[PDB]
């Protein structure tokens, strides 16, 4: 009791003090290099087909989007620090991919508090939930073959060179999506993805996003 | 009169060593778990679209939670028991709709109250949108929709929630409102998903209403 | 000539630096220590009138003014200086909510306060407010009814209390082209019993009835 | 080569060091000129009485604080700051409905002689009953703009022409500018003693043909 | 040896971020060029009611400074690395014909080059008046807006294209519009106002109903 109230005093500093090692002595990781490339996993957990505008082609969507990826800078032994395996931080103390979706219409707006989780491994775990409006065109919707639909996700400013992504699965997450929502999904992808582009020899890597659907009955 | 200097200058000194000389909690852990309460107060529900499937409430949610760090004795500081305090100044669970369709619209100023137990209360009064089909919504029986609350990061074993009572609190609902209230219900729920090893705990909204003649 | 303007903005710079530095923010009120915050509105138009969600929206100005010892000071220490602009940030400001509003209030005007040596501060922010209201009836002549509490959100009558000058509501500037005409606009101060808590609160009351302007 | 380790010293001599003026005041008030230049009546809505305009808004004024010598600092005449770098003045819209959009980068030139130039783009939602707007006499509005927390004795307005400027104003917008006029008016009221000035914009309008 | 290079960009972009104050901006004595080139996504929107065409592109900005050049063997062959678009200057090039403030698509991160040069590409999706009469006839409709630095004259900053042609190779195949040509075109000009000359690029775009 007061020896187990002592424990949990003592659980915070030595959270207190990782947190400090960590997040100082060598300060923010500077992104990936080609020296140094980083590996970000990508998935999709599809919540619901808000809205879909066929007088302006814009199709709105709420999902989650899991994100992972691992760093040296991020290591630490949990027998220096009372066995502690992991923690939560904000998403601002930690330097995180720009993944970003490649024909958003509008900007993107964030739905769940900005946190990732970090683990002793130096791996880390976020899992940003959001509204998306994309280009889509949604003519089919109203039929029994439906409308499909595709956006690209991929990093904004690093090539294939710098940032390389992959997948766990090519089937997105579907345990979530609403049962009532004014579409029903018919399928829905994420497939990794390798191009060239001309100019430049570099390599890019998006992850496609590719859904057919219709409207509900 | 030199009396409210005095009791101006023991808050500051209070505010100065909960925050100052000392970290801020680093939220809950495994070993040292957080219990907290939630309760909701339905004060409207503003919009229902059937095109879209998506419902605006306005609500107050009532959050309470309980600190070793926050403790002090009232003795120390002219007998101060509780004071109120930006809410940026202390850790706020990340309690969070699990079915939005737009970010939260915060209503009410960004305040809680810190008590000398270590206890807080915090209510944000909120603006709503999210997932709902409305069919039902002219008829009799109404329509009904559920919408879950819980952390998004933290598990069970981390942060558990609790309701003080199941039913939502429809005393300051608004008589005037387009939609009328037959029933609303708070329900604590344990849940295990393929995504996370740990159980979840969320608190279950589930509303019934209709449009109001 | 030129010297004098120097030394006053000198002086200027002194006095803020004394109040702000020389002492920290006011924490704000507390049951030994209750303030006593002066609350009028202007109100300027009528916007919107939304009957399939029932919200109405308002555009208003709302003078605020209280008085802190902490905010006095001797003009004759600062240059004969009875007074001064700030950026209202700089000061501890209440948190004066209205209870029915169904989206974040707008700020329509800079936010800026003037303090009085006295002690006395001025705030007028300039708002448009959405906020539940039932229209119906805003096409007859006897109009519509609406009424909005303001008050504090997070203390009570026993740390702040609220007063009107004038239980009438100032409709000198009000839209003369609106879409809506004014019938009547009150504000009254209210002792408040809500289930939710043991202590009174303290609101003004907003009741405005209007009508379509023909 | 060295004229940029100048700016920098003048930057920095300018703020950094310099007791950064407070605002002005009755025993040192500030003349603050103003100009609108008219680009668009993008909206016009008769059920809110609600229109909003498009323009950019021309705002300058003076400081000894800001003055330097020019050769005393590498022959510069002038810099451009972040608005945020200095002090400016709280001219607002008296009846806006909604918060003003800006639209152009908040940076500001300041001139040895201690002038500086801020000139935002702004759209603004304000009350006005479009009423006419279809036709050919058209529709009036007005709208004042001034300080919100400092009276004449303050700040005084001044205007360079009553006449706003036309010469951006968008050829093919739903509505073509029959006037528009920007006067300074002196106001006294009641409650107060101290005098006020506001810069009073009226509009008048119509669909084009 | 991989914790090595990291260790190098850390020290690279210190001593360019701290012993290097940054670039006050351009000078009538050292101006600056800034080229600008257009990649038009899609064609949102078009208001007829209002005259407001909405539009989504990529804008590409580079330019050139002195104060960002590195040796990369002073520094591991270290020859580019990305950095937030906060912590260097940029240009303040804006639309001049806007109707609401333009909404940034993309991440805020620029890539350097040790020869000095910045390359910053901010996806974005921009409202500006148009009168889009004709957009649903063969001829169609025609829109033009013009970029340019706000504050900064033809003394300050300088513009140039790469190319007239805007980069349509990415328009959206399913638009509710089809594009039948899309310029941009340098244009310098005196105004009434002022005696400095004026520097815009001006997008000009045919486009209608897609068939
Ligand atoms: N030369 C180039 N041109 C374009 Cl028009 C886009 C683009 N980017 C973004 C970018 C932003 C800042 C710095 N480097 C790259 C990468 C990209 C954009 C769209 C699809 N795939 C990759 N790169
Ligand atoms: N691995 C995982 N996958 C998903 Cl797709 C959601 C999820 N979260 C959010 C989360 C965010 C950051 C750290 N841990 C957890 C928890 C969750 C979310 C929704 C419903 N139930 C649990 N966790
Ligand atoms: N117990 C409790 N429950 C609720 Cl549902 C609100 C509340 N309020 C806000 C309020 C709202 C409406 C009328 N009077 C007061 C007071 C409060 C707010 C924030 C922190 N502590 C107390 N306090
Ligand atoms: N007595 C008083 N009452 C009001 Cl309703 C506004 C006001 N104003 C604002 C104003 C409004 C219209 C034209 N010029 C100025 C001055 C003011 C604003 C904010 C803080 N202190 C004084 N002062
Ligand atoms: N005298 C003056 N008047 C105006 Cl109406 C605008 C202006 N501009 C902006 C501009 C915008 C479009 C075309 N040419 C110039 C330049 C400017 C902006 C801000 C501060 N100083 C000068 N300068
Ligand atoms: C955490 O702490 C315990 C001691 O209670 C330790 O034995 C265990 O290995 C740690 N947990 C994990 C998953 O490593």
Not at 6 to 11: E, G
Not at 36 to 42: A, F, G, K, N
Not at 176 to 192: D, G, M, N, V, W
Request: aromatic share 12%; with cysteine.
């Amino acid at each position: 009791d007061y020896k187990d109230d002592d424990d949990k005093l003592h659980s915070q500093a030595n959270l207190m003090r990782l947190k400090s090692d960590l997040f100082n002595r060598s300060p923010m990781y500077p992104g990936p290099t080609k020296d140094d490339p980083l590996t970000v996993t990508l998935g999709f957990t599809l919540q619901d087909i808000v809205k879909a505008d066929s007088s302006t082609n814009e199709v709105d969507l709420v999902y989650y989007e899991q994100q992972r990826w691992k760093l040296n800078s991020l290591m630490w032994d949990p027998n220096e620090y009372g066995n502690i395996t992991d923690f939560r931080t904000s998403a601002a103390d930690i330097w995180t991919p720009d993944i970003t979706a490649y024909s958003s219409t509008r900007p993107v707006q964030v739905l769940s508090p900005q946190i990732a989780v970090v683990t002793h491994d130096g791996s880390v775990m976020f899992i940003p939930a959001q509204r998306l409006s994309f280009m889509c065109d949604p003519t089919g919707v109203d039929s029994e073959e439906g409308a499909t639909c595709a956006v690209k996700f991929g990093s904004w400013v690093y090539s294939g060179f710098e940032i390389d992504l992959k997948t766990d699965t090519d089937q997105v997450d579907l345990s979530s999506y609403y049962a009532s929502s004014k579409y029903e999904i018919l399928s829905a992808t994420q497939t990794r993805q390798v191009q060239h582009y001309s100019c430049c020899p570099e390599p890019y890597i998006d992850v496609n996003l590719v859904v057919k659907f219709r409207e509900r009955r």
